[PDB]
Write a protein that holds these residues in place. Structure first.
Motif: not given
Lengths: 215, 372, 91
Positions: B1-3, B8-9, B15-17, B50-63
């Motif tokens: 929960q949360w993180l 997913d958010e 994906q919508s963008f 740049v912010l999207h790439s950093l956030v996506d890369k942060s999200n991908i590593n955890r998954q």
């Protein structure tokens, strides 16, 4: 024969999305077979197959992987062997014949050619089936000699290339144009030729430096 | 929960963008020139990519750490998002370079390096300073992966020095500025261990108290260590892959661990081989020309007991480090000794001191324009 | 720069003049007033500049160009330090 026929659609597949799909493996693995068989090479295809095997461990084919590894050893001192180290875990690296091929490859990469010749399974079927492996390994050894020796001994050249009799030794020595030399050496490169320092012979700075300092 | 839920958010937004971006941007000059004409600010567009790439890369590593085989993230990111954003037109401005910079940064983290010959040849736009720094960051890592120590150090030195005439301003560095500077420093230190004696060219990029600290370590590593290599490996592998973020330690998960184990082996075997070569490269070429007694003292230095000295000396020489002539008759080994030079950097420094004064003259005059 | 252009304008007149002086001798007979006279003027130039000729002297000249460049570089650094002091005290 087979390589170019596949290549015309494989080069599209490698620049599509298709390279991340396992379904394409049965053409790509055959393209790897054809690279061993017809002595061709494709790095983007081999790297894609290794990445597919890396992501999906259950599709790891040992004979296909071994053919990519043996072709990586024909390409030294290119970085193909390093790319193979990156994409395969220890568990898939340590099986037969993969562990033997990796040990033989480190012996080539660390320039221990005499140890490589002494540690090679003579009666392995897979080694025979890599078209032109034997000339390519000796070409790598001769390339290391041609860069880094001005003159070499006759026994030393035979020792490095894997026990070549003086008939066979000519088919290597004359393949690079190398001369006989006195008592009783082989001439490879001149001492004046193998120096040529790019450093110190400089200080052409002034026309560039004066231009940016003009005002 | 949360993180995880926040991931997913972000995926739902990204994906919508992507669905919006894939849909509009091949016809919509009505949407686009309304965007060009109306605003009086522009820098936000660079920041969001740049912010999207950093956030996506942060999200991908955890998954990827949690689900270690057979799951969606690499294919869904690669096939749909990264390939669609790679294959469409660049928005007029440096936006095509920004999309390429994510694609290259994803390609780098997936270790699938080769396509730089294609990427560079499609990147013929003007390198306005930020896009030079991003390009150099990836190119220095590409040269490092290629094992081109001489080339990697020059590229890393430029972005470590940071005098690339950047003018940012508006939070674009961002949130990891210190970490990115140390990431360049860490590779530059590893490159210095391989290359030194020859540079002479570390003073530009690494300040003296760090030249001191890596110099102690470099001299000890090539004389006895173990622990410097252990320190160097543990700090470096952390920075080499650029994973952006960890998860959270606990007894129960394996997962992240399988992750870490794969990363450690791949870097270990290559760096171990390179470290052994660096130690072979340690001993000074004290004189060019060696008769048999000098060669014997070099063999004594090289190894002892007894058995097999000269044989391993052939291999140690032919790794790269000795290009030479032999005479069997005269008994003399004849080699060159490599040389290098100094008062190189000062010619660059005279240009950038002129820029530094001029930038300060511009700043005071710009402030002065509000008190006219 | 104005002096260098006057000197290059003069040097080009010398090239044209010596070309005419030689060609006058080739054509029929000429150069009598310009014989050991001009050969002393050209030597008077050459003895002063470049003075002598060997490797030791051009190496010394290039070392002096590097020192003059170093003084010029330090003068850019002093002017930039005066600018760093200037920029701190005008805010």
């Amino acid at each position: 024969a087979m390589f170019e026929q596949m290549r015309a659609n494989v080069g599209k597949l490698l620049k599509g999305i298709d390279r991340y799909n396992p379904e394409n493996l049965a053409t790509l693995e055959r393209y790897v077979e054809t690279q061993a068989k017809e002595n061709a090479y494709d790095l983007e295809a081999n790297l894609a197959v290794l990445k597919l095997y890396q992501f999906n461990p259950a599709f790891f084919q040992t004979t296909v992987t071994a053919q990519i590894l043996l072709k990586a050893l024909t390409n030294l001192p290119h970085t193909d062997f390093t790319l193979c180290k990156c994409m395969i875990d220890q568990a898939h690296q340590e099986e037969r014949p993969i562990r033997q091929i990796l040990y033989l490859g480190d012996l080539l990469e660390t320039c221990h050619f005499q140890a490589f010749w002494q540690a090679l399974d003579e009666n392995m079927d897979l080694l025979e089936g890599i078209t032109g492996f034997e000339d390519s390994v000796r070409k790598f050894i001769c390339h290391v000699v041609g860069i880094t020796y001005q003159h070499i001994d006759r026994w030393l050249l035979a020792e490095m290339l894997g026990d070549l009799t003086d008939s066979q030794l000519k088919m290597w020595m004359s393949k690079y144009g190398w001369s006989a030399d006195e008592s009783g050496q082989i001439f490879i490169c001149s001492q004046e030729e193998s120096i040529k320092p790019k450093n110190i012979v400089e200080k052409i700075d002034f026309d560039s430096v004066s231009s940016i300092m003009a005002s | 929960q949360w993180l995880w839920d926040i991931i997913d958010e972000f995926i739902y937004q990204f994906q919508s963008f992507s669905q919006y971006r894939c849909k509009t941007a091949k016809k919509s000059e009505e949407e686009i020139d309304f965007l060009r004409s109306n605003p009086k600010i522009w820098n936000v567009h660079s920041v969001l990519n740049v912010l999207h790439s950093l956030v996506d890369k942060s999200n991908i590593n955890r998954q990827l750490e949690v689900y270690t085989s057979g799951g969606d993230p690499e294919s869904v990111a690669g096939e749909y998002g990264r390939h669609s954003l790679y294959k469409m037109l660049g928005y007029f401005s440096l936006v095509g370079l920004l999309r390429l910079h994510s694609l290259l940064g994803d390609y780098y983290q997936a270790i699938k390096v080769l396509e730089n010959i294609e990427l560079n040849k499609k990147s013929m736009y003007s390198r306005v300073p930020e896009c030079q720094v991003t390009t150099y960051y990836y190119v220095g890592f590409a040269y490092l992966m290629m094992r081109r120590y001489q080339d990697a150090i020059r590229v890393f030195a430029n972005i470590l020095l940071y005098i690339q005439r950047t003018k940012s301003m508006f939070q674009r560095t961002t949130y990891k500025y210190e970490m990115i500077n140390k990431q360049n420093e860490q590779m530059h230190a590893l490159l210095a261990i391989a290359l030194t004696m020859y540079p002479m060219r570390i003073d530009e990029s690494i300040h003296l108290q760090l030249r001191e600290k890596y110099g102690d370590k470099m001299l000890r590593m090539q004389k006895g260590d173990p622990q410097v290599y252990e320190e160097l490996f543990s700090y470096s592998c952390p920075k080499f892959l650029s994973p952006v973020v960890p998860n959270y330690d606990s007894v129960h998960p394996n997962y992240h661990k399988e992750p870490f184990l794969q990363q450690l082996k791949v870097f270990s075997d290559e760096v171990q081989q390179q470290a052994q070569l660096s130690t072979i490269r340690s001993f000074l070429k004290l004189y060019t020309t060696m008769p048999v007694a000098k060669l014997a003292g070099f063999l004594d230095l090289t190894e002892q007991e007894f058995r097999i000295q000269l044989l391993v000396f052939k291999h140690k020489m032919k790794n790269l480090v000795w290009t030479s002539g032999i005479s069997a008759l005269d008994g003399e080994f004849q080699s060159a000794s490599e040389v290098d030079f100094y008062i190189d950097k000062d010619m660059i420094h005279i240009a950038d001191t002129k820029v530094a004064r001029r930038y300060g003259d511009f700043f005071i005059r710009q402030i002065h324009k509000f008190e006219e | 720069s104005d002096l260098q252009q006057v000197g290059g304008a003069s040097a080009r007149i010398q090239d044209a003049l010596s070309t005419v002086l030689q060609y006058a001798e080739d054509v029929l007979s000429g150069k009598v007033s310009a014989d050991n006279t001009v050969g002393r003027f050209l030597m008077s130039l050459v003895n002063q500049v470049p003075k002598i000729v060997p490797d030791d002297f051009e190496t010394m000249l290039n070392s002096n160009i590097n020192d003059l460049l170093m003084v010029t570089y330090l003068a850019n650094l002093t002017q930039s330090q005066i600018a760093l002091n200037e920029k701190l005290v005008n805010l």
